[PDB]
C-alpha cells in the first residue's frame, strides 16, 4: 500500500469511463440487487394520508469497467467518487417529497471490489403516500407500501431483485410508532407494463394495526360518562324542572362538542366510521333521556310518573349495555 499505486489503479479505472452508458450497453440487462435497513417511521398522517420513512438504501451491481487487479482488498473510496460513476436511476414511485441527508457530508457509500462489483449506499428520508381505509376506524388495519422502480430503463436494460430474498429488509423491529404496531411486512418483485415498455419494480409493504388505548382514554370514556350523567336525571324528582332539564341540555351540548372535536382532526371522508356509529348511538341515548323527562312533564301537570321513572331507571343501563356489547362484538 504505497498509496500511489492505488491512485494509478483508480485513475485508469476512470479516464475511459462514460457515465452516459450503462454497464453492458447493448448487452444483457444489468442485475441490480437492493436491500434496505429501516431506521424509523416518524409519522403516519391520516389527514395527509402519508408516512415518513428513514432508511439506508443499498444498491449492488457489477460494472466490468470498474474491475481492477493487483490490490486484493476492497476499495472504500470517498463518497464524492459517486459523481464520476454510473449509478442506477432508481426512484420511489409513490413518494411525495424525499431527500438525501447531507451533514456533515453527503451520506453516501461507494465500495468497489476487484471483480468490478459496486456497492452504493444512501441515507434517505422520504414521505410516501399511503391511502387509508377509515371505515372501521379506529379499529382499523392499514397497508402501506414503498414502490421502487427504474425511471428510465426498461427490463431490457436493468433488472431488480432483493438481496437475500425475505432477509433483504432489516430494522423492522426498530420502528416505534406510538399509535401503530407493525403486524407484518412483505417483499414483492414484479414487472409493470407501460406504453413505453415493461419496467422492473420492487415493493416493500407494511401492515399497521392501530392501538385503541388512546381512543378509549379520549373518546369512549367521556361519552359513557356523559350518558351516565344523563341517566342521573331520572333519580331527581319530577318537580325539579330546572335541575332535570339542565342535565339534558348539558349532556347534548357536551356530546355535540365531543363530535366537533373528534371530527375536526381527520380527513373529510364521505363515509361513516365506527366511532361515528358509537357516537350517534350515545347521542340518541341522551336524546331519549331528555325526551323521557319531557314526556313525563307533559303527562303530569300541563297535560304514573313513579312507574315510568322506575322503568326508565331499570331499562336505560340495560339497553346501553346491550348496545355497547353489540357494537364491540361487531367491531372485534
Amino acid at each position: 500500500g504505497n498509496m500511489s499505486f492505488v491512485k494509478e489503479t483508480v485513475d485508469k479505472l476512470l479516464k475511459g469511463y462514460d457515465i452516459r452508458l450503462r454497464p453492458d450497453f447493448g448487452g444483457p440487462p444489468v442485475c441490480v440487487g437492493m436491500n434496505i435497513d429501516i431506521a424509523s417511521i416518524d409519522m403516519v398522517s391520516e389527514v395527509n394520508m402519508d408516512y415518513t420513512l428513514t432508511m439506508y438504501f443499498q444498491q449492488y451491481w457489477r460494472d466490468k469497467r470498474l474491475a481492477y487487479s493487483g490490490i486484493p482488498l476492497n476499495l472504500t473510496l470517498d463518497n464524492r467518487v459517486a459523481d464520476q460513476l454510473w449509478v442506477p436511476d432508481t426512484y420511489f414511485l409513490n413518494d411525495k417529497k424525499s431527500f438525501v441527508h447531507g451533514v456533515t457530508v453527503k451520506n453516501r457509500m461507494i465500495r468497489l471490489h476487484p471483480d468490478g462489483t459496486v456497492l452504493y449506499g444512501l441515507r434517505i428520508t422520504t414521505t410516501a403516500a399511503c391511502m387509508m381505509d377509515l371505515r372501521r376506524y379506529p379499529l382499523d388495519e392499514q397497508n402501506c407500501t414503498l414502490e421502487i422502480e427504474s425511471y428510465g430503463y426498461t427490463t431490457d436494460d436493468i433488472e431488480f431483485y432483493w438481496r437475500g430474498g425475505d432477509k433483504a429488509v432489516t430494522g423492522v423491529e426498530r420502528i416505534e410508532l406510538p399509535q401503530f404496531s407493525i403486524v407484518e411486512h412483505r417483499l414483492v418483485s414484479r414487472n409493470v407494463v407501460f406504453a413505453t415498455g415493461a419496467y422492473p419494480r420492487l415493493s416493500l409493504s407494511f401492515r399497521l394495526k392501530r392501538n385503541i388505548g388512546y381512543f378509549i382514554l379520549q373518546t369512549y370514556m367521556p361519552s359513557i360518562l356523559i350518558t351516565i350523567l344523563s341517566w342521573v336525571s331520572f333519580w331527581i324528582n319530577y318537580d325539579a324542572s330546572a335541575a332535570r332539564v339542565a342535565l339534558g341540555i348539558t349532556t347534548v351540548l357536551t356530546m355535540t362538542t365531543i363530535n366537533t372535536h373528534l371530527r375536526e382532526t381527520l380527513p373529510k371522508i364521505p363515509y361513516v366510521k365506527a366511532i361515528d356509529m358509537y357516537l350517534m348511538g350515545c347521542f340518541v341515548f341522551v336524546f331519549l333521556a331528555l325526551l323521557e323527562y319531557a314526556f313525563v312533564n307533559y303527562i303530569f301537570f300541563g297535560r304514573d310518573v313513579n312507574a315510568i321513572d322506575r322503568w326508565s331507571r331499570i331499562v336505560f343501563p340495560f339497553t346501553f349495555s346491550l348496545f355497547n356489547l353489540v357494537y364491540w362484538l361487531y367491531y372485534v
Partner: nanobody
Amino acid sequence: GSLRLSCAASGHTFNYPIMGWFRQAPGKEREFVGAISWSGGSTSYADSVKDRFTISRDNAKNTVYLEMNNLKPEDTAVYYCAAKGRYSGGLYYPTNYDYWGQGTQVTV
C-alpha cells in the same frame, strides 16, 4: 342484444381500486374492453367499443356492471373481470392485473 354482465367482487377491494373488463375471442389474444375507477366511476374505453358498451360501479353490493348495446357478430367471446392494484400502471395490459374471473361466454 342488451346484455348486462355483472362482476361481483369480495375481499380486500380497497387495495385493488381499479376494475377492468377484458375480452378473449375464440383462439385470439386477450384484449382490453373497458376500465372503471374506484369511488366515482371514472371510465376508460377501447377504441373499438366506444359509445356502444358502458361500465358502471355500484360500491354498495361491490359489483361492476357492463351494459352492452349495438351488438355485432365480432362481439362473440369470453369476457373476464379483473382487479388492479393502486400502483400497477397502464389500463390496457392484462399482466398488470392480479385477480381474474372465470369468464362468461357470449355468443349473441
